[PDB]
Structure 1
Amino acid sequence: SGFGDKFKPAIGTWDCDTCLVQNKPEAVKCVACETPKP
């Protein structure tokens, strides 16, 4: 019933806490707002 199987990004994917953009595991800052990964 859910739609989880459509959204399974790479392990280590993380969300920016400033702007909520999803970032790649290798990124050390947000690709949109430049906020550092905590």
Structure 2
Amino acid sequence: GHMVIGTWDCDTCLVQNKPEAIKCVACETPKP
């Protein structure tokens, strides 16, 4: 919640996620 921006938005389920993750947090999609 602090200087952690960079979240990526999905393109299949339409859901944002943290850049520290490996996949989506809604559809479980493989991060690019």
How many residue pairs end up in the alignment? 29
User: Which stretches of structure 1, 4 residues or more, deviate above 6 A after TM superposition?
Assistant: none
Q: CA RMSD in A?
A: 1.1
Q: In structure 2, list runs of 5 or more residues that go unmatched.
A: none
Q: Which has the higher helix share?
A: 1
Q: TM-score, normalising length from structure 1?
A: 0.60
Larger of the two Rg values belongs to structure:
1
Q: TM-score, normalising length from structure 2?
A: 0.66
Q: In structure 1, list runs of 5 or more residues that go unmatched.
A: 1-9
